[PDB]
Amino acid sequence: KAQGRTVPIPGVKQALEKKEGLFRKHMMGKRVNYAARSVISPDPNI
Amino acid sequence: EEPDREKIKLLTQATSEDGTSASFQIVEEDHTLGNALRYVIMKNPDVEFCGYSIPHPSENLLNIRIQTYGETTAVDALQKGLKDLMDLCDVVESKFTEKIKSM
Amino acid sequence: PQNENARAEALNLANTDSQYLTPTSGSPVRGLIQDHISAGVWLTSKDSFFTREQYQQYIYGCIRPEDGHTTRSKIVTLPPTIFKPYPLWTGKQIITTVLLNVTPPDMPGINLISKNKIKNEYWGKGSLENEVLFKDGALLCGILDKS
Amino acid sequence: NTLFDDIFQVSEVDPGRYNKVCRIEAASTTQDQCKLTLDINVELFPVAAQDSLTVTIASSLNATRSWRPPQAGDRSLADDYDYVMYGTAYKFEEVSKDLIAVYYSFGGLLMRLEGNYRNLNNLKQENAYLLIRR
């Protein structure tokens, strides 16, 4: 909603809708503590 | 002198009140002793049920279940099994030495 | 999860065992996949026989009372299907014994008349090995497939 | 005590892609309408075509808690026969007037006896011993 400057700096509306948005990227979904990731291997003894 | 208690353990969570039936857990052992020991324990006329089970390959454990009929505890059946396996090995060692000389 | 309320939920609501049937069609999404299916067709085959030593080994090999697999605190065993000349147990008897030690003693055995993926023609003349029969928790007819 | 006893003539011994089991088709030498279809472990007790088998059904051997392996000085009904099997009766079928056919299972090893008079003695019992001679 601002005049073209000779990519502009993002406004607060842009901050809430950067990509998926603050609500989708940091509220509905979040990076969590006490969690781990690894390649799964099969096991019939457990 | 100090006897190590981690090697043989009696799983009280599975041991019978008598106890005619018991599950024993041996550390640092597998099929090697396991299958050989259950074979010898099964020759006992008082042993009703016997088998061995390895909970998981990654954990160094060996489980041996001995269910007997009356007049003999599972501990006695295990002690007889170990005593007989020792004598069995003596027979193998004696026959092999003799045939080496017989050559 | 870092609290008991979240623990209880992961153990009683979102736990694996409570997810045997999918809500899409109410059909199972849990079962054994490859070696176990091929193993079962061989183990439950008529030709599969086992000695006392072999039979008891297969029982304790999969059922450990110490790991709380039993419901009777003592491994119960069926009598052999062959008495004379040599005492022998059938493969299907192992399946009967596994159920006899994992199902509650207070409840009666399972009664089911199902079918197999393998047609009777493959098992020779006059076989009924396609008809899966369970009478009072005892596998009396038919092999066990992916089905 | 005994529930059934007869001498049968073997008409067929079929393996059917089995290396140790065989489906035996037999007929009674005494009764005309009597027929038999039985699975036996041919590896232990071999059966040939045109053979005389003394098939006998018993309730027990002359209250037991459980089966025990043989130990010196034990006497049984099995000592009179060669091959003995333990199984259960699962189905009772009626074929036309007076004729009745029973279905037994010795752990997958199936048996189908066809007769008429045995309706009283042969009952669906979770314990039925099958003993064979010769």
Side-chain angles (χ1 to χ4, degrees), chain A residues 28-43:
Chain A
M28 303 295 103
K30 282 163 174 142
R31 277 182 198 276
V32 295
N33 278 312
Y34 302 100
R37 192 169 163 94
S38 177
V39 166
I40 43 149
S41 291
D43 206 309

Side-chain angles (χ1 to χ4, degrees), chain B:
Chain B
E1 281 182 7
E2 187 253 298
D4 198 64
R5 287 113 196 239
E6 259 63 72
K7 250 271 178 176
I8 182 86
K9 222 169 187 202
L10 187 121
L11 298 141
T12 45
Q13 302 179 323
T15 313
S16 174
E17 205 59 79
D18 302 31
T20 18
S21 326
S23 288
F24 303 90
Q25 198 177 255
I26 315 141
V27 302
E28 279 290 318
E29 286 308 314
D30 59 1
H31 306 279
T32 302
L33 181 118
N35 194 25
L37 188 66
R38 66 128 282 271
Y39 152 75
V40 173
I41 289 159
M42 274 297 286
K43 306 316 265 291
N44 191 332
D46 206 83
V47 171
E48 178 244 311
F49 176 101
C50 183
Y52 81 106
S53 198
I54 295 157
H56 190 277
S58 297
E59 44 195 67
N60 243 305
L61 298 167
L62 176 75
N63 297 36
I64 51 111
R65 160 63 67 137
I66 310 152
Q67 303 198 347
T68 68
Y69 303 101
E71 76 196 291
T72 308
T73 59
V75 176
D76 298 325
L78 170 64
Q79 270 157 27
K80 193 181 175 173
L82 301 157
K83 224 164 185 181
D84 286 315
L85 227 170
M86 281 156 71
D87 306 337
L88 187 148
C89 288
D90 293 317
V91 171
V92 174
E93 207 229 75
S94 301
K95 282 262 172 184
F96 204 80
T97 308
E98 282 179 297
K99 286 286 172 154
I100 273 168
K101 292 177 179 177
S102 298
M103 266 207 287

Side-chain angles (χ1 to χ4, degrees), chain A residues 10-25 27:
Chain A
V12 293
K13 171 164 175 185
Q14 283 64 62
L16 303 175
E17 300 161 22
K18 200 193 170 185
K19 283 150 186 175
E20 299 111 298
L22 175 70
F23 273 76
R24 273 176 75 185
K25 212 203 170 176
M27 292 173 196

Side-chain angles (χ1 to χ4, degrees), chain C residues 100-121:
Chain C
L100 199 62
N101 284 91
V102 301
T103 64
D106 40 82
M107 273 211 268
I110 195 113
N111 301 76
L112 157 75
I113 300 158
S114 192
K115 293 276 174 288
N116 273 127
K117 289 207 169 290
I118 303 157
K119 203 178 184 72
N120 284 316
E121 275 87 319

